[PDB]
Amino acid sequence: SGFRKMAFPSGKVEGCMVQVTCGTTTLNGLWLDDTVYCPRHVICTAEDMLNPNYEDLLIRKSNHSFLVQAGNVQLRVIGHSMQNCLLRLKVDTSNPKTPKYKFVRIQPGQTFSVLACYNGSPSGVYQCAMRPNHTIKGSFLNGSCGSVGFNIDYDCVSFCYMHHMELPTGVHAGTDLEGKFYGPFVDRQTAQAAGTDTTITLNVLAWLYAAVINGDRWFLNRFTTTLNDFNLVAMKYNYEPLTQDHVDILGPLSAQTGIAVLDMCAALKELLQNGMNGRTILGSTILEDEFTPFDVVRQCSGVTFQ
Amino acid sequence: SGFRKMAFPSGKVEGCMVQVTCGTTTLNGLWLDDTVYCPRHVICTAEDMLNPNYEDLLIRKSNHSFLVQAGNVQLRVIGHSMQNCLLRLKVDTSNPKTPKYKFVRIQPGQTFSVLACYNGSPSGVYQCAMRPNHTIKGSFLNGSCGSVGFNIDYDCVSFCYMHHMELPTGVHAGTDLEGKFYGPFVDRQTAQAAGTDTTITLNVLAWLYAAVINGDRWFLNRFTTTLNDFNLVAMKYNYEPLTQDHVDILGPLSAQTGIAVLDMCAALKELLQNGMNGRTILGSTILEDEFTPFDVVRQCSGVTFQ
Ligand SMILES: CC(C)(C)NC(=O)[C@@H](c1cccnc1)N(C(=O)c1ccco1)c1ccc(C(C)(C)C)cc1
Numbered sequence: 001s002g003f004r005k006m007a008f009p010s011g012k013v014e015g016c017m018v019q020v021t022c023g024t025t026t027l028n029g030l031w032l033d034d035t036v037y038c039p040r041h042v043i044c045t046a047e048d049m050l051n052p053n054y055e056d057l058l059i060r061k062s063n064h065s066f067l068v069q070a071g072n073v074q075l076r077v078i079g080h081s082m083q084n085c086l087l088r089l090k091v092d093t094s095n096p097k098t099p100k101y102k103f104v105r106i107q108p109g110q111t112f113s114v115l116a117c118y119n120g121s122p123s124g125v126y127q128c129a130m131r132p133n134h135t136i137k138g139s140f141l142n143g144s145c146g147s148v149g150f151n152i153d154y155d156c157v158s159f160c161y162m163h164h165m166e167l168p169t170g171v172h173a174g175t176d177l178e179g180k181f182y183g184p185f186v187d188r189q190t191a192q193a194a195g196t197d198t199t200i201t202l203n204v205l206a207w208l209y210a211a212v213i214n215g216d217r218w219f220l221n222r223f224t225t226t227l228n229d230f231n232l233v234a235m236k237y238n239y240e241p242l243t244q245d246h247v248d249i250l251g252p253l254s255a256q257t258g259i260a261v262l263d264m265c266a267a268l269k270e271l272l273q274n275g276m277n278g279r280t281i282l283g284s285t286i287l288e289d290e291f292t293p294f295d296v297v298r299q300c301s302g303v304t305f306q
Numbered sequence: 307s308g309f310r311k312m313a314f315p316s317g318k319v320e321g322c323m324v325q326v327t328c329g330t331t332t333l334n335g336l337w338l339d340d341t342v343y344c345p346r347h348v349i350c351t352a353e354d355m356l357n358p359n360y361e362d363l364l365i366r367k368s369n370h371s372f373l374v375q376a377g378n379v380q381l382r383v384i385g386h387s388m389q390n391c392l393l394r395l396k397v398d399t400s401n402p403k404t405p406k407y408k409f410v411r412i413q414p415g416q417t418f419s420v421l422a423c424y425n426g427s428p429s430g431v432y433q434c435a436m437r438p439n440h441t442i443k444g445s446f447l448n449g450s451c452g453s454v455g456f457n458i459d460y461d462c463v464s465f466c467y468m469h470h471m472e473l474p475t476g477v478h479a480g481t482d483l484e485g486k487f488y489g490p491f492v493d494r495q496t497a498q499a500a501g502t503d504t505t506i507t508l509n510v511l512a513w514l515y516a517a518v519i520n521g522d523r524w525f526l527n528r529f530t531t532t533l534n535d536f537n538l539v540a541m542k543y544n545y546e547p548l549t550q551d552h553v554d555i556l557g558p559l560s561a562q563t564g565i566a567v568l569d570m571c572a573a574l575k576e577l578l579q580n581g582m583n584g585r586t587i588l589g590s591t592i593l594e595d596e597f598t599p600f601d602v603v604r605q606c607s608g609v610t611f612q
């Protein structure tokens with residue numbers, strides 16, 4: 001029993017973290033086989049974060065311009081290339097700790113674990129969602145750049161995020177491991193700001209199922225709803241529209257609990273319209289939206305208290 | 307910026323997890339140097355969880371009664387002893403992955419990271435507090451026994467918890483690594499239940515400081531309070547009494563923010579008396595009590611937005 005924001009064990013990612021330094025700038029790099037991945041903004045001059053030309057800033061560098069340290073071992077750089085907003089650094093040593101891995105681009109609503117790192121040294125691990133506005137509500141300080149987000153499945157690490165920058169509202173922006181930003185963001189100082197966000201409706205529903213699995217039914221009701229009538233209400237409260245695809249994804253949870261998806265939607269529509277009336281769900285007064293249906297099946301019992 | 311429930315990186319603990327099997331019972335063990343630690347209830351017969359005599363159940367076992375597996379390697383047991391509610395199993399191999407470590411007994415209010423494990427295989431990591439009633443609100447399923455709680459300081463792992471059982475309310479009970487239970491709990495099936503809990507007042511205050519550090523002052527007020535007048539209010543709302551010792555601990559945070567502890571106490575007393583008035587603090591409507599002052603200093607900027 002219980003329900004916690006749960007991250008994946010971080011050991012496999014920890015053995016991949018390194019420090020990358022160019023001139024006076026230091027940040028974190030990711031060392032897989034004989035490549036170190038890092039944010040390209042490591043080569044940005046302090047003089048103008050405003051108008052950097054990365055192609056131009058990069059030709060001015062050689063392999064030995066880059067200092068890479070894994071623990072107390074220096075890694076000799078023997079090649080470099082830019083890929084979108086990342087630098088790909090060839091090194092003289094393959095990481096003996098390279099886990100089985102993949103690079104994946106996650107979609108808004110999906111969750112991942114973040115290993116916060118400073119100076120190549122892991123400091124903490126927490127769970128996050130990719131927000132509909134393509135930011136994450138991370139916890140990151142100066143020098144956290146190059147920290148990565150990931151999921152694990154049967155000892156394969158799926159890397160999905162590398163941290164680049166903090167936005168004025170204190171939320172975070174970054175890229176997949178191909179260096180393509182999530183969202184409309186760019187790796188320079190502009191007036192850019194996080195767009196309006198919405199609540200991840202699918203995740204709220206997953207979490208209501210978790211609460212039922214764990215033994216709580218207080219918020220259910222005798223009603224059903226059509227998908228269309230639900231969306232008219234849900235969108236008034238800044239919830240993402242629910243689609244038949246989202247209804248389908250919730251099939252296994254629905255089957256475990258015996259609660260029809262549209263019946264759970266009616267329950268949610270009532271919670272939105274009436275409030276919580278004091279009362280909590282899995283210890284929470286706010287409707288939680290950073291657990292996916294997959295996260296719920298993974299963490300919860302397969303039985304159902306019931 | 308940001309503020310997240312943050313666990314310690316789990317890699318060092320992951321390399322210590324093993325599977326321990328006695329007869330039909332399997333659970334997790336902790337392998338440090340040439341010793342494997344596990345819950346003694348591994349030797350409990352399925353026939354009577356009600357009245358087990360562990361001394362009596364243990365003499366009936368030899369070294370080869372215990373199967374220990376680290377990954378796909380079998381560890382030969384070459385000695386065993388009981389220490390309080392744990393079994394200490396001598397094995398033929400020292401764990402080459404043993405980190406620098408200590409065994410500590412934590413106090414109520416203190417926080418730690420939990421590495422949830424099943425069949426010797428780590429599945430997730432989350433942060434918890436030791437509750438005033440000596441339980442933890444974990445997330446644990448059948449077979450999670452022997453999962454450990456820990457903190458890390460300068461590459462030394464301080465082990466503080468080993469998981470033993472779930473209580474009727476779905477909260478969790480266990481021991482320190484000397485095998486002494488936290489709380490009045492015993493490792494057998496009885497009518498035992500978690501005692502009445504209270505809110506960790508010191509942690510709520512730490513978290514209000516975090517919110518100020520991160521740039522938010524909305525809940526502050528022009529008032530101060532005496533420690534005594536605060537406790538009279540606080541205890542009405544099921545908060546632990548604040549002592550001068552707790553006031554002292556909050557010194558560094560107070561100094562970083564320029565807010566007197568008793569002034570923050572007045573702020574909290576107002577939040578308790580008036581409610582939240584909608585409104586959130588660091589994304590939360592409930593006053594959060596599972597971050598210590600040490601957790602705040604560790605995660606937050608040392609500057610102050612402010
Ligand atoms: C507010 C802002 C000026 C944008 N700061 C950051 O983005 C922090 C930062 C701070 C906290 C968490 N993550 C990043 N930040 C950094 O911490 C940083 C840069 C290099 C090493 O650490 C940062 C990131 C990118 C830049 C650009 C792309 C403009 C060169 C500059 C600084």
Ligand SMILES: CC(C)(C)NC(=O)[C@@H](c1cccnc1)N(C(=O)c1ccco1)c1ccc(C(C)(C)C)cc1
Pocket residue numbers: 001331332333347350355446447448449450451470471472473493494495
């Ligand atoms: C509700 C209760 C019957 C007490 N179940 C548990 O404690 C679960 C358990 C379930 C979920 C999380 N943690 C423990 N539980 C177990 O999962 C367990 C026992 C052995 C391997 O896994 C358990 C723990 C202790 C016992 C005693 C001490 C009575 C022999 C029995 C079972």
